Nucleic acid binder design. Structure first.
Ligand SMILES: [Zn+2]
Lengths: 34, 221, 90, 486, 213, 86
RNA sequence: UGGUUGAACAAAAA
RNA sequence: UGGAUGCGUUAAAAAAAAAAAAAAAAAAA
RNA sequence: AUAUAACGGAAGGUACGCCGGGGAAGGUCAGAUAAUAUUGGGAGUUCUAAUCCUCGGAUUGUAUCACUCCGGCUCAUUACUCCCUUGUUAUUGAACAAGAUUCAGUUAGGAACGAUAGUUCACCGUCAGAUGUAAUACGUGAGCUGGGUUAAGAACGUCUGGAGACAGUUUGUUCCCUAUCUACCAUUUAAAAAAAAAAAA
RNA sequence: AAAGGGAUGUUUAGCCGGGAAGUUAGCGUCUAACAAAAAAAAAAAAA
RNA sequence: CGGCGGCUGUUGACGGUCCAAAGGUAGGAAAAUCCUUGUCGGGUAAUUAUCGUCGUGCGUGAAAGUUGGUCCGACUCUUCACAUGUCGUUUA
RNA sequence: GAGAAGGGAAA
RNA sequence: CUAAAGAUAGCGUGAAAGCUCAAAAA
RNA sequence: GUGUAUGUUCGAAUGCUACAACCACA
RNA sequence: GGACUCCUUAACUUAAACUGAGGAGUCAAGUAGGUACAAACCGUACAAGGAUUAAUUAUGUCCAAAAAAAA
RNA sequence: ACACAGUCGGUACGAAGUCGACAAGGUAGUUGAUGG
């Protein structure tokens, strides 16, 4: 949605950013849906 | 009432399953540049000429832009303008040579760029935002701008960019007007002779040849 | 024309075509029924997308990046205040 | 749907996840370690025995063997070359362009170089295989040819009769061993090899000698099949021998042992036709083409033994071949697809604006209802026929045409056309402008001797005066309009 | 974008809608007769008219094809076979020998192509005012005629329009298939019948469906 | 941008694209896509046919590749239903 | 492939 | 003998137009 | 024996208020919900797709509901084939006329006033025969007003014993700033027409 | 240590909540997920 | 100083039953009380205003006073008239 | 060849 | 010519008529 | 192609309103 | 009576840099590099001090910008 | 100054002479590497 938490990591971040949501939300959806 | 202009996909096949879904050109097939019929086959391109002037220190490159990609040529031109090919390169001066590019009308952009691309020019505090001009419009009005706008934004954004920009000269046509710089498009020369015959010849007997010519003559005419 | 987000052949005479509209558009043409003439012009908005380089940290079981070791490492012999109380024969 | 719920639900790990936390340049684990071969010959022999159909696969086998060893087994090299030739051996659906591409490939050149380097290891039992491969690939190797021909001449009395026949046919196809003197030497001008004139004639004479010896020492031993003779030759071998004699134009050949000696060509035709009926002839294949070509060339050139050569073939056979010539025989026997030199010269002609040049156009005598030969190009307004020689020269700057093109040259001479042959060994050295200049010079020697026939698209000439003024605005002359102007 | 990022459907759902078909109510049956036989291919040959020679190397030998397309020209000087000029066109794939370009090459130089438009209704008539190319078509009693000399000028020297004695059949003939088709389809676009009144033109064998209020 | 103080990341990405506003409108509506510097027609999902391998997950690639493949043109396509893969 | 082309068509291909 | 304004009069055409403020082979003023 | 069960052991008001300290229309989220199609169902003589209503899932999105110091006037800026005007000839359950549903631009010109009312959105009346919708800190108060609304006075109803109070109703009640910077609109001789510019050795 | 009126002084609670509240207060007490050197499932056995 | 009912049968004159010291009477009345603009009528092209009216709804209420007559007010409001730059819309 | 989703523009 | 032909799969009619498809042959 | 306008429903229902059956041709 | 990332969870609309737990990592109290731009992600043979030598960290190798395509 | 206005670096004399200076020059103190 909006940048501060919806921004994806980039090559060099190893899939994490200080205030990011996208990765954990995607993993939760993959695990148990929505 | 008004509607969209006719693009390149209105004049050919479209294959949605291919990566290159349709062929795109700067103009329509009938509007593409060509050589005047009687004034053709008189010239040939050396494709690149270099002039060294050790006294003034201002050297020249003259390049043929016919059939080259805009970005592929722009990167090389930026290298030459900066002078990074020189062992005495310095970031704090326009340390490169001068460059002339000919045949900007014949520059190529791969894919659907000719139909899709646009160029923006900022307008300070203007409520309508930047002025946007079409790539086809730029190709119709001034083909040199296509190469110029790529080279400018490939150059570093420091205060030396205008100097190297000023040291660049682009032209749509084959010949440039510079007084004391050689041309890359030059008059053609006769092909060099060879010491061997590529073909052998054997002559039919005259009587049989006469018979055949006579037989064919009435059947034709 | 029937403006759709998807195209389908409704009868034996339907066929798929490309139309040169404002842009290239997919569609269906039919000799039998004019109502079978379709154009794929109003699909739902496309998704944001997931970059492919995030796959290792998205798909599959994920284990903590930094291991839990301190609690198992705890012991009195490594603490200055408590080492004297340790007894090897009592 | 391959979703792999085990992974997607979060129960198992992925290779990518595991490798995202390792150094980028670790070496993958070799899951299965099997001992590598100790002997390369047997390994690659097994692989070649598995590979017979794909020239890509054969060349890949050779490239891997080369990467592993700098001196691969010579027998394996010979086998690889034979397989590559058999991939193009005379009954396939390949175009000549594919053979040219294979010849141009660097790997093929490396294989030929490896063969040349140790050419001294060639045994007498492999010469027919190499000659067959050369004929099939249309690659005449003047480096290797002297050694092979020396073997052939040395083992003359030891070859099998069908082997002699096949070797004669292959040599005639390549254009070697003809009766023309000073035209059968190999090597550069400063270092010329032996003269191999009459080799095919000696092969045919050996076959004739054996056939005559049969009359004195006949036997009734078992035959391989109904179509095999006492010497083990089929009708195809005799037809090919006759075709080679026709290609070299040795019509009057005969065994010198007797003054009253029948024609060797007549003997070959008779023994090719003896075991064949008409139903069998309909399916014989190349035999039909060989027989009809022999008869047609004999008729065209009218040699001394024309009557005997004609009497050799049954009249019913002649009638069947004549009536079936235009059905399948010639079309199935002519080269298929495209030739690169032909395409290049066609492009040159189009550039020069020769609009009456007909590709693969036949010619014949004024009274022949059927044509048996096709010229590469027929410039019909100039009475000229352009032929193309894409074979390797006998040496640097010493080109020579194949037997096919030599026979075609003689036929076109008899028909009354001029023949101009382009040799690729010289043509490839030129560039576009030099090619155009030389082709113009060639055409200058044969000025237009007739008017050129046009193949114009039809049109309604009577309307040539009509004018379409696109952008002429619609005129509103009267209100209300009496006529709705478009 | 595609190729660097997965879509939501392909990532979360694995693109199951692709295989979620019902398999009944098909517009066509599947091809079940292939059977992956691996049949014996053959070298098919056809004897086309010699006008096929108009299509030269650019068509026969320079186009990229899966298998070779052999071409030869037999130029010799009731039908008996031998003694006529023709073109041998052969290939291992029969589909090549059914190409429409080969037939178009002959028809362009021999006989061309033709189409017919049929007019119906009261007061509907096509005529010349007074002669070709002053083609006029009236689509009723009170309807002013349509002037169509511009199309004749457009396609002059390559197509012609003939009118019937009764002024109800318009035959477009020509020597270029694409041009003839475009001319006929403009004429049809422009004389098309009103389905409620049925006054106007229709393409032969493609009648317009009468509609009722 | 402009009077819209804060917008979505995707909307900003669309706004920054250097193409004509009408091709950009097609991209917004989903009839075209921006990919590696080019505006293209989106990939087509055909019922009963395998997708292009690039669009499926690495573990699903083999299964997708084993499916039937269409190698014709849009006119020959007999698929019952088709839509843009997303 | 054809200025044939506003929501319209023809040719060729597989 | 006059001025301003509209509640008065006229035009609604040109945009490569109307017009403008830096002639520029001058690459270290 | 004792009270600590608040079990480490019970009066209220302040809108007259004062002092010290600290500050909630956004930023974000996306449940309802909005757009797009799609699935199932129900209407449409017959008909699942001319057209209408509704249900589920999908993607996209935030009009409405669930970290400061209202309305109108004036001046506006931007988006959406968007309210009228365009696509002869898309589809139509399209005779015509008046219409309906989308899709499409080199985006072209335009859509008047009032009664009650603090109002917005609305209701009613006239003209016209062209509902437009949304955003811009629900644009704009160092540009204007101050009708509603949230201080001191005072009154009615209601609650308490009372002082007092009410997301009850009313009447009265000081709306500051000479513009430094950004922005914009106007505006501007030049080489010189102020002073000075003194070398070479 | 009585009663009534008037003055003076003091107090008038914790936690969640704009607030009113509702409920609640010592002690004891029910509801729990983390993994394959938890699978002879890289390592072992056998050879 | 203060207070002045509830659940029910016959729209209920008239009964049943519980409670209470008494169960709010007369007279106002959509009000400075109630309330998004209650019904009907006058004024208007159009009346969330105002006046009269109904007692429909919420209700008020009798010297902590109820209902009225005339006159009065730098008070809050309705309406008619006047020349009117308050205004369409501004100018000298 | 990739959120290449900072700008140019590349197979 | 052989062989095949849904108490009907798509059209069509107020109802009929008529075309196609399935099957077989080539 | 043919028993056949198969039976019931229906003012009718002739492959094609809707249900039943879905047999039959040396 | 702290913040964010990760793993496992309760509450929430399987919402929020939401609230509340159990453990590791950084910040807090840690510079200079990468990740486009003001903590919490990656990486460090982590910063006493000076210097025109060297190293495969993350991560790159068309240009802005350092870094391969002889014959 | 583009600059919280600083920090690290930052131009390499003369030939600007001339009665100059291995193999070729066609005598320029000019020239040698390069056919598809
Ligand atoms: Zn259809």
């Amino acid at each position: 949605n909006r940048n501060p938490s919806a921004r994806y990591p980039k090559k060099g971040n190893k899939g994490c950013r200080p205030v990011c949501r996208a990765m954990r939300k995607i993993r939760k959806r993959l695990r148990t849906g929505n | 009432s008004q509607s969209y202009p006719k693009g390149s996909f209105h004049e050919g096949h479209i294959n949605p399953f291919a990566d290159v879904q349709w062929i795109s050109r700067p103009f329509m097939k009938r509007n593409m540049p060509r050589d005047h019929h009687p004034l053709a086959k008189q010239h040939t391109s050396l494709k690149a000429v270099t002039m060294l002037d050790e006294e003034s220190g201002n050297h020249w490159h003259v390049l043929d832009g016919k059939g080259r990609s805009v970005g592929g040529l722009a990167a090389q031109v930026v290298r030459l303008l900066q002078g990074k090919h020189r062992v005495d390169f310095t970031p704090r001066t326009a340390a490169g040579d001068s460059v002339i590019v000919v045949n900007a009308i014949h520059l190529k952009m791969a894919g659907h760029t000719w139909d899709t691309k646009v160029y923006k020019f900022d307008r300070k505090t203007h409520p309508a935002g930047p002025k946007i001009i079409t790539a086809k419009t730029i190709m119709a009005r001034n083909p040199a701008m296509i190469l110029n706008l790529a080279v400018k934004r490939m150059l570093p954004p420091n205060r030396l960019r205008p100097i190297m920009y000023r040291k660049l000269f682009v032209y749509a046509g084959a010949l440039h007007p510079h007084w004391q710089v050689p041309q890359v498009i030059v008059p053609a020369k006769t092909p060099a002779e060879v010491s061997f015959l590529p073909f052998s010849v054997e002559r039919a007997d005259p009587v049989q040849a006469a018979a055949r010519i006579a037989a064919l003559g009435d059947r034709m005419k | 024309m029937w403006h759709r987000g998807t195209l389908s052949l409704l009868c034996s005479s339907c066929r798929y075509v490309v139309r040169k509209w404002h842009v290239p558009i997919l569609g269906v043409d039919c000799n039998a029924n004019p109502r079978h003439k379709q154009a794929l012009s109003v699909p739902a908005p496309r998704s944001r997308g997931i970059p492919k380089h995030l796959y290792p940290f998205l798909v599959g079981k994920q284990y903590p990046r930094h291991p839990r070791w301190r609690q198992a490492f705890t012991h009195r012999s490594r603490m200055g205040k408590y080492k004297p109380q340790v007894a090897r024969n009592g | 749907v391959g979703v792999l719920a085990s992974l997607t639900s979060g129960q198992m790990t992925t290779r990518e996840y595991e490798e995202a936390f390792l150094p980028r340049r670790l070496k993958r684990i070799k899951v299965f370690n099997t001992p590598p071969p100790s002997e390369l010959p047997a390994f690659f022999h097994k692989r070649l025995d598995n590979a017979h159909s794909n020239p890509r696969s054969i060349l890949k086998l050779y490239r891997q063997y080369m990467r592993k060893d700098d001196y691969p087994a010579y027998d394996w090299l010979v086998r690889c070359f034979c397989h590559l030739g058999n991939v193009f051996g005379f009954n396939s659906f390949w175009a000549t362009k594919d053979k040219q591409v294979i010849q141009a490939l660097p790997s093929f050149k490396f294989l030929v170089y490896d063969l040349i380097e140790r050419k001294h290891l060639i045994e007498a039992r492999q010469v027919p295989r190499l000659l067959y491969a050369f004929a099939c690939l249309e690659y005449r190797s003047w480096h290797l040819l002297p050694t092979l021909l020396e073997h052939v001449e040395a083992n003359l009395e030891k070859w099998r009769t069908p082997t002699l026949a096949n070797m004669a046919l292959t040599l005639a196809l390549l254009g070697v061993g003809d009766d023309a003197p000073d035209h059968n030497q190999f090597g550069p001008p400063d270092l010329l090899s032996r003269d191999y004139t009459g080799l095919v004639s000696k092969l045919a004479l050996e076959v004739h000698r054996r056939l005559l010896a049969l009359q004195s020492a006949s036997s009734s031993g078992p035959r391989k099949s109904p179509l095999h003779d006492s010497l083990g030759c089929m009708p195809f071998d005799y037809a090919g021998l006759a075709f080679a004699l026709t290609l070299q134009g040795s019509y009057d050949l005969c065994l010198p042992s007797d003054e009253t000696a029948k024609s060797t060509l007549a003997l070959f035709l008779q023994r090719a036709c003896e075991p064949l009926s008409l139903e069998q002839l309909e399916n014989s294949g190349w035999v039909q083409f060989f027989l009809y070509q022999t008869l047609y060339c004999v008729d065209v050139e009218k040699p001394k033994r024309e009557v005997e050569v004609k009497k050799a073939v049954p009249f019913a056979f002649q009638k069947h071949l004549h009536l079936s010539w235009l059905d399948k025989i010639l079309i199935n026997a002519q080269p298929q697809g495209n030739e690169l030199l032909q395409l290049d010269v066609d492009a040159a002609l189009k550039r020069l604006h020769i609009t009456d040049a007909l590709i693969n156009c036949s010619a014949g005598r004024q009274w022949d209802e059927q044509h048996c030969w096709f010229a590469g190009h027929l410039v019909r307004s100039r009475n000229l026929a352009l032929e193309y020689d894409y074979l390797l020269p006998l040496g640097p700057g010493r080109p020579k045409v194949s037997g096919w093109l030599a026979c075609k040259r003689r036929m076109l001479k008899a028909f009354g056309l001029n023949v101009a042959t382009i040799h690729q060994s010289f043509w490839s050295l030129l560039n576009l402008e030099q090619k155009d200049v030389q082709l113009t010079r060639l055409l200058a020697q044969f000025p237009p001797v007739l008017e050129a026939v046009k193949d114009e698209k039809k049109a309604y000439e009577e309307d040539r005066h009509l004018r379409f003024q696109r952008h002429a605005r619609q005129k509103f002359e009267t209100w209300p309009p009496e006529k709705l102007e478009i | 974008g595609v190729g660097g990022s997965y879509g939501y459907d392909a990532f979360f759902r694995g693109a199951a809608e692709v295989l979620n078909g019902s398999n009944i109510q098909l517009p066509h049956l599947p091809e079940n007769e292939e059977q992956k036989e691996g049949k014996v291919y053959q070298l098919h040959s056809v004897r086309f008219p010699p006008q096929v020679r108009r299509l030269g190397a650019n068509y026969f030998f320079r186009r990229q094809r899966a298998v070779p397309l052999t071409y030869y020209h037999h130029l010799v000087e009731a039908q008996t076979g031998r003694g006529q000029a023709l073109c041998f066109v052969a290939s291992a794939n029969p589909g090549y020998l059914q190409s429409k370009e080969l037939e178009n090459a002959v028809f362009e130089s021999t006989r061309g192509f033709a189409c017919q438009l049929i007019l119906e209704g009261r007061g509907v008539k096509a005529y010349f005012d007074p002669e070709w190319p002053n083609l006029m078509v009236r689509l009723g009693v009170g309807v002013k005629p349509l002037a169509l000399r511009r199309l004749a000028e457009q396609y002059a020297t390559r197509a012609k329009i003939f009118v019937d004695k009764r002024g109800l059949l318009l035959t477009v003939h020509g020597y270029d298939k694409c041009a003839v088709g475009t001319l006929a389809m403009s004429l049809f676009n422009h004389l098309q019948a009103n389905p409620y009144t049925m006054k106007g033109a229709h393409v032969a064998m493609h009648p317009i469906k009468k509609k009722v209020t | 941008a402009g009077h819209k103080h804060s917008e979505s990341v995707l909307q900003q990405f669309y706004n920054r694209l250097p193409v004509r506003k009408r091709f950009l409108k097609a991209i917004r509506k989903g009839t075209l896509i921006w990919d590696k510097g080019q505006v293209k027609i989106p990939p087509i999902a055909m019922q009963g046919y395998g997708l292009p391998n690039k669009l499926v997950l690495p573990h699903q690639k083999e299964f997708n590749n084993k499916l039937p493949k269409f190698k014709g043109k849009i006119n020959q396509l007999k698929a019952t239903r088709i839509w843009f893969q997303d």
